[PDB]
Design a protein around this ligand. Sequence first.
Ligand SMILES: C[C@H](Oc1ccc2ccc(/C=C/C(=O)O)c(C3CC3)c2c1)c1c(Cl)ccc(Cl)c1F
Ligand SMILES: C[C@H](Oc1ccc2ccc(/C=C/C(=O)O)c(C3CC3)c2c1)c1c(Cl)ccc(Cl)c1F
Lengths: 572, 572
Amino acid sequence: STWQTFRRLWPTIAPFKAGLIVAGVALILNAASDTFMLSLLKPLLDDGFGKTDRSVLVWMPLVVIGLMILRGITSYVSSYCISWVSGKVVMTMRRRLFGHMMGMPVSFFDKQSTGTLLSRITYDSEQVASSSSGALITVVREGASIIGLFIMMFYYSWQLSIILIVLAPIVSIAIRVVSKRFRNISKNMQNTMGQVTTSAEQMLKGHKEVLIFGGQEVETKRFDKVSNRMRLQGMKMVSASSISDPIIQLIASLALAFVLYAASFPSVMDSLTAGTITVVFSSMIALMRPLKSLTNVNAQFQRGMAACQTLFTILDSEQEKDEGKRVIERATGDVEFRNVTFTYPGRDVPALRNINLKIPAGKTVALVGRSGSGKSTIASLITRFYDIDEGEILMDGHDLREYTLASLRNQVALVSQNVHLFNDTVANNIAYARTEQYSREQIEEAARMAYAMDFINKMDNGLDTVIGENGVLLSGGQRQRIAIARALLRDSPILILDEATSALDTESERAIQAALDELQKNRTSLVIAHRLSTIEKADEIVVVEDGVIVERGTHNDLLEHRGVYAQLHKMQ
Amino acid sequence: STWQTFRRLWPTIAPFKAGLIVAGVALILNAASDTFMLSLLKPLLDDGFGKTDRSVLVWMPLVVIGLMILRGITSYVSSYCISWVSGKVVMTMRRRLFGHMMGMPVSFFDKQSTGTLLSRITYDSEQVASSSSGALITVVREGASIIGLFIMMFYYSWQLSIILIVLAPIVSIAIRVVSKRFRNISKNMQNTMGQVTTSAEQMLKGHKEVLIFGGQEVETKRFDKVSNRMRLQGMKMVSASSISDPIIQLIASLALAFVLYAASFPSVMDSLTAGTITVVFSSMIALMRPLKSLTNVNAQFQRGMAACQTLFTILDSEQEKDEGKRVIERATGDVEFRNVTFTYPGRDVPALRNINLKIPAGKTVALVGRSGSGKSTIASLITRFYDIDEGEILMDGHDLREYTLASLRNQVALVSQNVHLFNDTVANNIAYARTEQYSREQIEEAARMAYAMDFINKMDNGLDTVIGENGVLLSGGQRQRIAIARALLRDSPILILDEATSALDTESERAIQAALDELQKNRTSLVIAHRLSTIEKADEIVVVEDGVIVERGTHNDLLEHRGVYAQLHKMQ
Ligand SMILES: C[C@H](Oc1ccc2ccc(/C=C/C(=O)O)c(C3CC3)c2c1)c1c(Cl)ccc(Cl)c1F
Ligand SMILES: C[C@H](Oc1ccc2ccc(/C=C/C(=O)O)c(C3CC3)c2c1)c1c(Cl)ccc(Cl)c1F
């Protein structure tokens, strides 16, 4: 199943064919030069030696020098042009693949990790590029070499050529059966690999359990046995790998010796002089390598095309499905969660069960709970990063999923100290998507209201300073201030803040708190605060623990009573 | 700094020299056969053209076959013997390395995970073996080849030999400067490598942060720019390699052409016949790959030896130091922790601060706290898995660190459902540390008292059934029962159990609870229980939260009052 998916891959290189033609003529001319080198070397030098070498002997070195200059030039041109085509095609493939990955659910990003994801992407792209390019160049160049060497062989005493071509099927089938016999079964030695991995793993905390049990000699004996086993397995693998090649080499020498013995038959040395037999056998020795190269590159073609297929499968699986198609721009902000039921993949215990809550506009709602609880899940669900597994939430008389994903996600802004900064200038990062729609004067006024004047003055480039640099030049407080400024500039109707990830150990936090209060004063919001002042200033507080509401009552009455809530706040 | 650390490595193979000598004679004879092939081919073939064609032309195909049989036999023998030596030396090295890591503190097992430790060890061992073996075999074989081909060259018209040997220093410095010029530095492309990862992770979990911006076009443009840059960098690297190689090829051809033009000078064709020049040039061509490999193996030797050096550093780094040297076997069990202060590496907030507690013998102490709290750290410190950073704990009038590590860890037994199962038989895993000192009748009686009769009867081999199999054949309840049986058989004076990792969703738990109560009835212990019945049956309960005691009082009085503790138990 490779032809169909190679044909499907043709369009991404269809307009890129001038480089292919340039490489395809460069490689053919390269093989032609390679054959023509032997052509003008061996017979001319070994036949002009008979009282005529005075001219051809000094003629030869210039020919050799020019031929090698041509061969090197063609090699450089072909490699550079194939690299150009491969770079352009991987550029296009990476671009489309990243574009597809950006607009697809967050769960995929969760159940992979950034490092392994990007390693997969880049490594697989370069792998398919290298495999396909190598297969193409080897097929073209070595097929041209085989054709040229057969042409020269038939032009020089076709009898040896026909002997070789009739011996070819026997040698080929012998090599095929030997190679098939000498391929091992890689489905048993994994038991030893897994066993040693477990003994390292089940006996690390089990080393604590080995120390607790006191046994150290038993582990050494067990590792002795398993290491002896894996050493034996590896030695057997090396023995197979080293018994493979000499058999093929010996069969090749049987073929060459049979050809030489056929040459021993008379009536053909009459037309065969020293130069002719010399060039014929040199042609055979040169032809030795290309066939092995051809088989190995068919193998690597299959290998790389498998990776191309799995990359296509990765590109094809699902997307950001917009089943709603009921776009409602400029949402009023009627927030009310009901019948919330969702769980992480694989797990069978839902994070929330029949959770019901209301966050009316114009009122302040405080989210209080332990770190690592379901508050983060609820906040993510409010932004519809991951759709609720069960239940439905209706906003302003319409379902949350009914509204367009872009429309819903645009009306909500989340500000947190853990919001990383995009690798762009500070002015650019303040307007990550509204750079062209925001006036410079308005942005400057917002930044002045963002309490960033002290940071702007200290900046070398002021408001145009390049922020980011993998977080080396940006601090946590600066990142939080930039996030607050971005939220204020966006001025979304509903704001959900996650202060749990923030650290309270801040030297200067009063200004940040005042700025946050000013930003949240005009627009109603429900933030998960972690400060006593913010909790006290909240208009309404709902007690929810472990994704469930345990106590219901007025926030002011609960604060005045100072019961379980006060003790919990004092403890944490 | 390679000679000294290679000399330090000599003892591990010093007794192992018969295989080295066998390989060293096999490789020399292989190179001799390689030279002797061209030897008896070319001048004798020329003598065939001199009216002696029938005599030698039928004689060649048998010499060729015999020579290739000898070459293949020597290749197989040398590869097999070198593999045997390498396998045995890495066997010894792996054994010693595993023995060293067994007795060295726990933090290593944590700060590298099991995969990035064992893959490290196995890959590095096979890497150093392959690198050293390849360097040795290439140096010996290819030096023998160079010596033999120069011997033939001097034996046949030494003029060309001296003409090339005088050119060798000229060519070798040009090759050295050319190779250096194209040895690029990898200093800046990592910025793009990290930049693409930053761009991916910025909106991966920050799709809502991408939605905070509200657009994806900016991300697509940024990825366009960065992908163009990285494609250009890869283009430049490929171009550098593809201009590097043909320059050396062309310089080699200049050298060969100059040799041929020197042969064009008269007064030396008088002693040079067609076969002589043929074999001379064949030798010159054949030497091309040898010197390339001989010049390249330095890099591979260094690359392998660096991995060997870092393996030595890993084997050297610190140890399980027993600073106590005050072994007190058969401890009474006077448990009292005081001034406990310890933190994880890197962090600046200690897990516990001036923690003081007492667990007198003959009394039951219950450890109650939230999941993931400092109870696990306290339990680990009681077993001295990781020494306390600050403070001191005295047991039975002597410091905890004063007693021998083996002696201290032997007197304490930890039973939990997460206890890993050793890859051995059920009977073997029951006495994983004291199999030889345990009577069969006593083990059978303990197993009968272990409530394992139902599982033993269902086992195909009964008590001799092979447990483990990477946990496929063992269930969580069976693992917990086996751990309880092992603890009962050991019958340590002090038992610390971690029931937090256990799962309460067990179909049959009454028998396990009864067995645990029977095991803990005779010997006093302080276990971290998670069941209401176990908490109620506890003689003394201490309220500790966040590594600190908030409330102090009688357990019975607190239970009767049913205040904060009852509400916390009902909630969780
Ligand atoms: C008659 C024969 O043809 C063939 C036909 C299929 C082959 C498939 C694989 C390989 C090598 C695989 C490897 O090295 O792993 C060879 C060989 C030895 C060169 C093949 C030679 C032939 C040989 Cl045996 C020698 C020289 C010439 Cl010119 C030749 F045609
Ligand atoms: C004059 C030259 O000597 C030398 C001396 C050091 C070298 C170091 C490396 C390499 C290969 C590098 C690569 O392929 O990357 C070669 C070459 C071309 C064969 C070296 C040739 C020479 C040649 Cl051109 C032919 C035969 C002989 Cl006996 C010989 F000495």
